[PDB]
Design a protein around this nucleic acid. Structure first.
Length: 1073
RNA sequence: GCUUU
């Protein structure tokens, strides 16, 4: 309950010249007392009288009611920041070394010197793009410093290391003043031109870095990055993190986890000797020298000290540096520069062509319905992003303009213009509009915003391809329900003194122009073989259209902005923006490794234990008939690099016997690591999310980094949430939401009152508040209704429906109309109306919670019923599993040591149910977990009608509606839906093995009847409760269940009527991946 | 205001 106490200290610190705590209660008499108290406080404040007596008088309200919010009457003028800053601004300002970056605009020159005029100005290269200000970030850091000013021992040292660093930020900012933001949290030319261009973004990165510094090492690291970052805006992250790829090969393996036949982690006590040829050491030294030539001193030395022994025990520092480098900010170049960088492929093309054929051979020969109705499938899938151009769209009687894909498809159909048979050109006559992708450390990459003809022509085929990948192990990212641990396990498995692993970064090759000829040609040749496999008109056309998109792309042209002009240049490289992007890139990366591996063997003989492609990297484990020597590693590596070299591929190819390093993960000393470089105070782009969503996303981000090994102080994160979640009532009246409002599992949830522990209402006030928030979950949008009522819109819904189903529509039909009514939310105006409505409703709700006929069941209600029927009891679980993920905080790690871990994702969509599979066999429709959940619970006759309504044949529909499987699906769908409502796949829980025998013993549940739904929920509720206690207490408890038989029947009815909850916290997990 | 997968 410390967030509420913390918020007051912050408000009191921020404003000094009143605060009005607003409470509420589920009890009537208590609430009146709350109402009376709020009134007296306002009146006393409106008379400069002390509220001390009132607090004593309404002691009962403070003691038992629930704090709902805090009123802030501050008559200042959003200043204080300028005044506050000077005391910390005593150090010497930093001076940008305008000689470090190649592209001139990447140097921290004075804004004016880059944009001499207000019309030449652009924040496109420094925009933090986040709904929180620099001024607020400074206030948050200062507030923290004041609080930990009188600390002692080690806590003081943390304050001292931080105070130093903040001085650099302060001193530098003062020399120019604090950049004032506009209503849209953007920094304009007038504020900007006096000050260094990158001043604001750099301040955000430094503040974020310093507020994450605890040890002396963090402080040394933060200081170097902060000082270097101010001048270097293009190679510091790459220079700092580059040595890591060499390092993983160095550390020896002394016992590691592997993957067994059951596809699960299992400890192996083996030893693998790290074998490194002398050349690798020179390469590492060159990397270290480069860091040194760039000003870096402390960071290179740490790697150097580490290099003497190379102990996995002192490897955490190396990992820490790798995670840290990302927090320097994103490299935001100019579209043109990002764009500009861009005989022996016979084997490579053939593999790409062959792989394409295998993935579709079976679907095509049979005459798969999805291939036949591909166009219908493309339409249902269609997003609401960009089609490319801003079109004038007339809806009903409203002439509005949008660039949205969904909008363009409806308008085009309503005017015979909808023509997917014709796949538009993307050459000189019709230049491809451009999208961008910004990442830390790496160079900016471009993205094709192709017209919807392209998505539709490609959506069905890609889906078939993904399915082939789903059951193919080479495709690490798509295989089964697998998570990163299984991939980690697979590399370790075959490691020994007679095998070496070969990892390779091929991010550069994908964007290579050398790559595009063999790529498109390989896919097309494959498409032709597939076409000569059937005579189906639907299959050939869908198949043919896919062939056409590859052909149009072969010679594409792009629209690159060059100031305020749009130069058109002939782009001859494979960029992304296609539906087949990830799958195709995966097929190509795998083909490339196979091609290199085949070429190398002509020389040396080895065995291919495993080959893998995962995103932008690819790797393989080879086995030799003899023991691996340093000389052998060098020979295999030189030959591999040369083979890559002959193909004209600029790639990083390394060889080792113990580790690997790829963009998503890295294995050092038999242990698994994940870069923790998600930036907090700077974003990649500007979306359409709100401050509240942004606050939830930041918290989510804080949690992922903390699990990954980088921890930003929670008090700082809490302070940021208080600023972001606040709402202005006027210019001197600001409202701050309480801890209960923020964390309770509702539609307005932003974070968990306790990290890694999700709570659910177990008190009446919490229930009362939870019900009230839902009451105002979905808000109306006039603009949305208009278009929802327009012809062009209704016809589109109708047209899609008449093409999909045969018999009758409504469970399916109501859904199609909504799905479409939603894709209108991408359209700002509609989104803006919704936010304004939410704010007014929220302001009133915080002021005095309303009523609600409830009558709506949720997950929290089901849990609340079960709680009272369990008897706790101290228990003991010994730690039995060695740590394989070193960075995990201690409380999370302990749960893994005691109950173990998992290498899969729990089915939470219902796809593995027979009914969902049956629908897939005959329909192109895809029901959600929620729809399946309502449908499965329908009367036997209704289910038969729904299946038929979707084109499912009668013998099949009839056979299922009775069978053993239908009864089984019922349990399976609910089980899938419930897991979905409990975030069992997100955050910290995704790690834990919920079917641990050790966990299982702690649950003592006596069967008093036998009714699946109830048995599954009671065990799950118990597992979560036991685990949460372990997460918060470090010890365990055993749970006993004495749930009545009469009670179970009541509960079972309750279970089939659970409503899902939508909230920023929920969106944030979805947002992560 | 722009912002594919």
């Amino acid at each position: 309950g410390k967030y509420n106490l913390i918020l007051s200290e912050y408000l009191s610190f921020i404003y000094n010249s009143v605060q009005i705590p607003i409470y509420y209660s589920s009890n009537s008499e208590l609430e009146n007392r709350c109402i009376e108290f709020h009134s007296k406080c306002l009146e006393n404040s409106k008379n400069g009288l002390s509220l001390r007596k009132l607090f004593v008088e309404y002691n009962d309200v403070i003691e038992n009611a629930t704090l709902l919010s805090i009123l802030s009457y501050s008559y200042d003028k959003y200043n204080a920041v300028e005044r506050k800053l000077v005391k910390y601004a005593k150090g010497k300002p930093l001076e940008a070394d305008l000689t470090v970056n190649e592209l001139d605009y990447e140097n921290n020159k004075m804004t004016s010197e880059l944009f001499p005029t207000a019309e030449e100005y652009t924040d496109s290269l420094m925009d933090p793009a986040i709904l929180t200000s620099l001024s607020s970030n400074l206030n948050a850091v200062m507030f923290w410093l004041e609080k930990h000013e009188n600390d002692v021992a080690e806590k003081l040292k943390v304050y001292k290391r931080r105070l130093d660093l903040f001085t650099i930020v302060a001193s530098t900012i003062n020399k120019y003043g604090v950049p004032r933001h506009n209503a849209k949290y953007r920094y304009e030319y007038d504020v900007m031109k006096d000050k260094p261009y990158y001043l604001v973004t750099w301040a955000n990165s430094s503040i974020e870095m310093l507020m994450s510094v605890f040890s002396h090492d963090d402080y040394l690291i933060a200081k170097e990055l902060i000082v270097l970052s101010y001048s270097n805006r293009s190679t510091l992250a790459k220079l700092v993190s580059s040595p890591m790829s060499i390092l993983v090969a160095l550390v020896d393996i002394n016992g590691t986890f592997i993957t067994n036949e059951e596809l699960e982690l299992e400890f192996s006590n083996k030893y693998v000797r790290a074998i490194v040829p002398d050349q690798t050491f020179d390469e590492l030294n060159q990397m270290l020298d480069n860091m040194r030539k760039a000003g870096l001193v402390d960071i290179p030395k740490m790697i150097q000290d580490w290099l003497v022994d190379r102990s996995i025990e002192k490897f955490p520092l190396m990992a820490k540096i790798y995670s840290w480098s990302f927090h320097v900010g994103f490299r935001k170049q100019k579209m043109l520069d990002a764009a500009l960088d861009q005989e022996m492929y016979r084997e490579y093309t053939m593999l790409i062509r062959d792989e394409v054929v295998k993935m579709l051979e079976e679907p095509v020969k049979h005459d798969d319905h999805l291939l036949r109705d591909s166009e219908l499938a493309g339409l249902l899938s269609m997003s609401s992003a960009s089609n490319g151009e801003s079109r004038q769209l007339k809806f009903g009687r409203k002439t509005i303009f949008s660039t949205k894909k969904n909008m363009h498809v409806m308008d085009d159909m309503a005017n015979e213009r909808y023509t997917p048979g014709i796949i538009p050109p993307v050459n000189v006559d019709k230049p491809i509009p451009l999208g961008r992708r910004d990442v830390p450390g790496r160079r900016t990459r471009i993205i094709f915003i192709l017209p919807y003809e392209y998505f539709i022509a490609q959506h069905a085929v890609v889906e078939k391809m993904l399915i082939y990948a789903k059951h193919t192990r080479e495709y690490a990212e798509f295989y089964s329900q697998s998570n990163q641990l299984l991939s980690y396990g697979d590399v370790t498995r075959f490691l020994s003194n007679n095998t070496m692993v070969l990892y390779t970064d091929v991010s550069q090759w994908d964007s290579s122009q050398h790559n595009t000829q063999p790529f498109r040609k390989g896919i097309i040749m494959g498409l032709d073989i597939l076409a000569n496999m059937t005579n189906d008109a639907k299959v050939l056309q869908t198949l043919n259209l896919y062939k056409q998109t590859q052909i149009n792309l072969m010679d594409s042209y792009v629209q690159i902005p060059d100031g305020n002009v749009i130069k058109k240049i002939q782009y001859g490289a494979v960029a992304s923006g296609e539906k087949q992007t990830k799958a195709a890139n995966s097929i190509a990366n795998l083909a490339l490794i196979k091609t290199v591996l085949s070429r190398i063997s002509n020389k040396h003989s080895f065995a291919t234990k495993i080959i893998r492609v995962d995103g932008d990297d690819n790797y393989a484990v080879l086995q030799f008939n003899t023991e691996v020597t340093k000389q052998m590693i060098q020979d295999v590596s030189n030959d591999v690099r040369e083979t890559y070299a002959r193909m004209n591929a600029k790639v990083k190819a390394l060889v080792s016997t113990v580790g690997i390093e790829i963009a998503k993960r890295y294995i050092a000393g038999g242990k698994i690591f994940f870069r923790a470089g998600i930036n907090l105070l700077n974003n990649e782009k500007r979306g359409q999310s709100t401050q509240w969503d942004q606050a939830a996303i930041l918290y989510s981000n804080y949690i992922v980094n903390r699990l990954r090994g980088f921890e930003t102080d929670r008090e700082f994160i809490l302070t940021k949430i208080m600023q972001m979640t606040s709402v202005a009532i006027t210019g001197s009246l600001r409202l701050f939401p309480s801890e209960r409002v923020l964390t309770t599992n509702s539609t307005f949830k932003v974070f968990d009152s306790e990290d890694f522990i999700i709570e659910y209402g177990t008190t009446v006030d919490e229930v009362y508040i939870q019900r009230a928030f839902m009451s105002l979950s979905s808000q109306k949008s006039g603009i949305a209704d208009e278009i929802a009522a327009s012809s062009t819109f209704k016809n589109y819904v109708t047209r899609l429906s008449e093409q999909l189903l045969f018999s009758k529509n409504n469970i399916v039909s109501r859904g199609i109309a909504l799905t479409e009514k939603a894709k209108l939310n991408s359209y700002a105006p509609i989104s803006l109306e919704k936010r304004r409505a939410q704010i007014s409703a929220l302001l009133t709700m915080l002021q005095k919670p309303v009523t609600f006929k409830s009558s709506k069941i949720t997950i929290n209600d089901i849990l609340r019923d079960i709680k009272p029927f369990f008897t706790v009891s101290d228990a003991h679980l010994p730690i039995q599993y060695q740590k394989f993920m070193p960075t995990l905080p201690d409380n999370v790690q302990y749960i893994i040591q005691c109950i173990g871990s998992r290498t899969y994702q729990i089915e939470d969509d219902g796809s593995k149910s027979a009914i969902s599979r049956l629908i897939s066999k005959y329909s192109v429709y895809k029901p959600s977990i929620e729809e399946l959940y309502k449908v499965i619970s329908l009367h036997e006759n209704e289910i038969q009608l729904y299946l038929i309504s979707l084109g499912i044949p009668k013998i099949d529909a009839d056979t299922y509606v009775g069978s053993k499987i239908y009864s089984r699906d019922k349990y399976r769908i609910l089980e899938s839906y419930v897991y979905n409502l409990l975030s069992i796949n997100y955050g910290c829980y995704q790690l834990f093995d919920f079917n641990s025998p050790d966990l299982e013993k702690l649950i003592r549940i006596p069967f008093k009847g036998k009714i699946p739904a109830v048995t599954f929920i009671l065990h799950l509720y118990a597992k979560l409760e036991v685990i949460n206690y372990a997460i918060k207490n470090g010890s365990w408890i055993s749970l006993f269940c004495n749930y009545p038989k009469s009670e179970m029947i009541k509960l079972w009815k309750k279970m089939w009527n659970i409503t899902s909850l939508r909230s920023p916290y929920t969106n944030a997990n979805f947002f992560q991946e």
